Amino acid sequence: GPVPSRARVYTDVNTHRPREYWDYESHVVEWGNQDDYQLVRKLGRGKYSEVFEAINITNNEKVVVKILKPVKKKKIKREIKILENLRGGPNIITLADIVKDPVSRTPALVFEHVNNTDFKQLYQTLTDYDIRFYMYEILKALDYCHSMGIMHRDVKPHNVMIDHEHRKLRLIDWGLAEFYHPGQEYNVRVASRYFKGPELLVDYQMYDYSLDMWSLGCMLASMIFRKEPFFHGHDNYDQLVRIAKVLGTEDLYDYIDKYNIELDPRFNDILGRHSRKRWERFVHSENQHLVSPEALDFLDKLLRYDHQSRLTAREAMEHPYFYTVVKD
């Protein structure tokens, strides 16, 4: 069978927390007053929820309300418990309230509001300095949640809310997040296709916080090279082929051989043989102002097949790429 794996950091955080910290199935939800919140505008819909701009009429402040679609009670409790555990942490979206929606007959999560700009428009304008700054802000959120025993598992541009006017960033959508427990096997049907780590694509279930670092590297690659998404697969099999055309097939085989993993035999006709590429190949006259030797080395250290070889969030914050970012 497969060789087991452990996180190289924050391995035992949940073991030594009180059980109530991670035992979300036992969590008792504290409900607020549903009439405190008046819906104003629908912002989006998905398979799991609908999201609205709203007003909190006890302070006349904007909030965001996520009205959950019917899903299993443990997954609702998991997201609620994670949001409560992380509340107040650096750049973590604040859960302000939880109320029972009378129409949906489901919980509605009330969040602080971010006056954000759309990433499809924001990424057109961010400077080299902007990208370094906001990457550092994301890392603060990821090191925090990892240090608190939680992996996000859905890092992608859509889940990073940026108020560019105030240089404010929030990591949102903790609905796929999980508590890390050493030796636990997790569902690989997490993250969006373009941000799925190799561990998910080869069906290796004993993964950890380092999944979020692959996803972050995918975001970084798309920003500095001006190609969004960077690894643009047509499905989950082609996604791994796209990765292998950049990182090469020999190191993919080294990865699965290390963990005594077999590829799906359907890769026999589609994977091919590919050398590992040098990152300079993706530099051109229209992105070179976003690229530096520091950026390429940082990217190279995030995008590793072996989840055990990727930079941790704290290690990433030590990288020379961030030396030019003004510290607070």
Binding mask 138-177 for ligand A1IYV (x = CB under 6 A): -----------------------x----------xx----
Q: Toward ligand A1IYV, which CB reaches closer, 51 or 295? A: 51
Q: Which two tokens stand for residue 85?
A: 């555990």
Q: Is 43 annotated as a binding residue?
A: yes
Give the whole-angstrom CA distance, residue 135 versus residue 207: 23
C-alpha to C-alpha distances, 260 to 2, 202, 264, nearest whole angstrom:
5, 11, 13
Among 13, 54, 64, 219, binds ligand A1IYV (CB under 6 A): 64
Alpha helices in the chain, H assignment, sequence order: 13-16, 19-22, 73-86, 119-122, 128-147, 198-201, 210-225, 236-247, 249-258, 293-302, 313-317
Stretch that binds ligand A1IYV, among 49-57, 230-238, 271-279, 316-324 (CB under 6 A): 49-57
Give the whole-angstrom CA distance, residue 42 versus residue 74: 26
Q: Are 172 and 144 in contact (CB under 8 A)?
A: no
Count CA atoms closer than 13 A to 21's CA, side-chain side.
Answer: 15
Q: Toward ligand A1IYV, which CB reaches closer, 114 or 201? A: 114
Give the whole-angstrom CA distance, residue 290 versus residue 108: 40
Q: Are 155 and 176 in contact (CB under 8 A)?
A: no
Stretch that binds ligand A1IYV, among 40-48, 97-105, 211-219, 244-252 (CB under 6 A): 40-48
Q: Is 170 annotated as a binding residue?
A: no
Among 77, 78, 81, 113, binds ligand A1IYV (CB under 6 A): 113
Q: Does the footprint of ligand A1IYV cover residue 112 (CB under 6 A)? A: yes
Q: Cβ 113 to ligand A1IYV, closest distance in Å?
A: 5
Stretch that binds ligand A1IYV, among 25-33, 105-113, 176-184, 292-300 (CB under 6 A): 105-113
DSSP run (H or E) holding 55: strand 49-56
Q: Is 50 annotated as a binding residue?
A: yes
Burial of 16 (0-12, 13-18, 19+ CB in 10 A): exposed
Q: Cβ 115 to ligand A1IYV, closest distance in Å?
A: 7
268-327: which residues touch ligand A1IYV (CB under 6 A)?
none
Q: Does the footprint of ligand A1IYV cover residue 49 (CB under 6 A)? A: yes
Catalytic residue among 97, 143, 154, 208: 154
Q: Which two tokens stand for residue 159?
A: 């889940």
Q: Is 51 annotated as a binding residue?
A: yes
Q: Is 45 annotated as a binding residue?
A: yes
Q: Does the footprint of ligand A1IYV cover residue 46 (CB under 6 A)? A: yes
C-alpha to C-alpha distances, 309 to 8, 175, 296, 302, nearest whole angstrom:
9, 27, 16, 8
Strand partners, 67: 50, 108
Is residue 257 flagged as an active site residue?
A: no
Cite the active site residues: 154
Query: Binding site for ATP, residues?
Result: 43-51, 66
| Contact set with ligand A1IYV (CB under 6 A) | 44-46, 49-51, 64, 66, 93, 111-114, 116, 161, 172-173
